């Protein structure tokens, strides 16, 4: 309400064109090579040869003023793992204005006056390409400014930095905003931005979380990178407690096998998700949807099913197995639900076959004619006290163009 009312620029894909739907009619010129609406309706990709977007504002409503800028961004590995500084959004016409820069795993917002003097807010999104970092992951950015002279930086609704801006003087805002990288770049160096908005007020933490919660699309399951999960797409599924292990069948019992090369992310047996009630090929998976899992193992497709008999040693614990006969079988139907978290894109997996179970990974003796131990994904009953266990969190890693190897 009050939030939407203060929007003076809102870049959205309407026809098959990126336009300003704030009502203020800014002119938006998109380069011919720029790809729009590839992951999210209102996203655009900056990868192509010097491709860019120019926004010429047609108003004069808007440093010592109240304003906010928000958008989501996803930066590829090759671009984050570079020592060069890249300007991606620029308002600086002459010497004053603002700009967003990328450099060595850090994202930086700069506000400078005519004398080349500047102040900034910085955030290390890529620890060191760490699993816990945001390299090639969608994350929400928000920058606010107030007449008090403070500019703040929020990431996924969390305040990261605050800065007093009295050191600077003459800072006039340009009527032009240019998206794009001017520096020469390589093939796999790319980034995506979605839902770029500018507000004529300083959004409060409450306001920001409302924007964040509304644009993350809570009912759409997410893959590891933050893209919406899709049917008929291959995924490497990993458990949050064993990020260095991939799912694999031993003696028709799925177990978590350690990666041969700990740096190679795409390791294992790809799993494709199928919809029980057929829809459209690669359509989005919503929470509560019934799904079936197919694993590609040695060039053959198998359906993952829950074992009917419990493993000896809550109450019941069942191992997962593979079945060559594909089709709709209750024992192979699962349900997925996103986990609420600002640090990860994970989900929990449930089965309501004969008893309500939730998938978890832990140490067990899954076999019948053996006492061998193994880290194994299991479907367990009475999981009420397990809802917060990280051992119940699963990540779906897809082959993403922003992470090549």
What is the radius of gyration computed over CA atoms, rounded to a whole number of angstroms? 24 Å
CATH third-tier fold name of the largest domain: Jelly Rolls
Based on secondary structure, the structural category is: mainly beta
Label the CATH architecture of the largest domain: Sandwich
Morphology: elongated
Give the helix tally: 3
Distance between the termini: 45 Å
As a percent range, the share of strand residues is: 35-45%
Region (C-terminus of receptor binding domain (C-RBD), Hcc): 219-405
Motif (Host ganglioside-binding motif): 381-384
Region (N-terminus of receptor binding domain (N-RBD), Hcn): 2-218
Region (Ganglioside-binding loop): 364-374
Give an overview in words.
The PDB classes it as toxin. Keywords: Botulinum Neurotoxin, HCR/D, Ganglioside Binding Loop, toxin. It forms a monomeric assembly. Crystal structure of botulinum neurotoxin serotype D binding domain. The protein is Botulinum neurotoxin type D. The chain folds into two domains: 1-223, Jelly Rolls, CATH 2.60.120; 224-405, Trefoil (Acidic Fibroblast Growth Factor, subunit A), CATH 2.80.10. Strands 1, 2, 4, 5, 7, 12, 13, 14 and 16 form a nine-stranded antiparallel β-sheet that branches. Strands 3-6-15-8-9-10-11 form a seven-stranded antiparallel β-sheet, with no helix packed on it. The longest helix is centred in the middle third of the chain and has 11 residues, at 205-215. The chain is elongated. A hairpin with a 5-residue loop joins strand 25 and strand 26. The chain has three helices and 28 strands. The protein is mainly β.
């Amino acid at each position: 309400n009050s939030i939407n009312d203060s929007k003076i620029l809102s870049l959205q894909n309407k026809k098959n064109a990126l336009v300003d739907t704030s009502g203020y009619n800014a002119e938006v010129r998109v380069g011919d090579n720029v790809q729009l609406n590839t992951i999210y309706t209102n996203d655009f990709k900056l990868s192509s040869s010097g491709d860019k977007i120019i926004v010429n504002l047609n108003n004069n409503i808007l440093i010592y003023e109240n304003s906010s800028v928000s958008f989501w961004i996803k930066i590829s590995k090759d671009l984050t793992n570079s020592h060069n500084e890249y300007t991606i959004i620029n308002s600086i016409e002459q010497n004053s204005g603002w700009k967003l820069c990328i450099r060595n795993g850090n994202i930086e917002w700069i506000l400078q006056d005519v004398n080349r003097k500047y102040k900034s807010l910085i955030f290390d999104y890529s620890e060191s390409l760490s699993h816990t970092g945001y390299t090639n992951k969608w994350f929400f950015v928000t920058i606010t400014n107030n007449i008090m002279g403070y500019m703040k930086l929020y990431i996924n609704g969390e305040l990261k930095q605050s800065q007093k801006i009295e050191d600077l003087d003459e800072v006039k805002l340009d009527k032009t905003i240019v998206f794009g990288i001017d520096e020469n770049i390589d093939e796999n160096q790319m980034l995506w931005i979605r839902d770029f908005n500018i507000f004529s007020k300083e959004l409060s933490n409450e306001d920001i979380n409302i924007v964040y919660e509304g644009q993350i699309l809570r009912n759409v399951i997410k893959d590891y990178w933050g893209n919406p999960l899709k049917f008929d797409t291959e995924y490497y599924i990993i458990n949050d407690n064993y990020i260095d292990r991939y799912i694999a069948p031993e003696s028709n019992v799925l177990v978590l096998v350690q990666y041969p090369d700990r740096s190679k992310l795409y390791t294992g047996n790809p799993i494709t998700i199928k919809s029980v009630s057929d829809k459209n090929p690669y359509s989005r998976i919503l929470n509560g949807d019934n799904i079936i899992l197919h694993m590609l193992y040695n060039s053959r497709k198998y359906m993952i099913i829950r074992d009917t008999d419990t493993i000896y040693a809550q109450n019941c614990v069942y191992a997962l197995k593979l079945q060559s006969n594909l089709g709709n079988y209750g024992i192979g139907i699962f349900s997925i639900k996103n986990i609420v978290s600002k640090n990860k894109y994970c989900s929990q997996i449930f089965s309501s076959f004969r008893e309500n179970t939730m998938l978890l990974a832990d140490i067990y003796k899954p076999w019948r004619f053996s006492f061998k131990n193994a880290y194994t994904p299991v479907a367990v009953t009475n999981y009420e006290t397990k809802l917060l266990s990280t051992s119940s969190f699963w990540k779906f890693i897809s082959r993403d163009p922003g992470w090549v190897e």
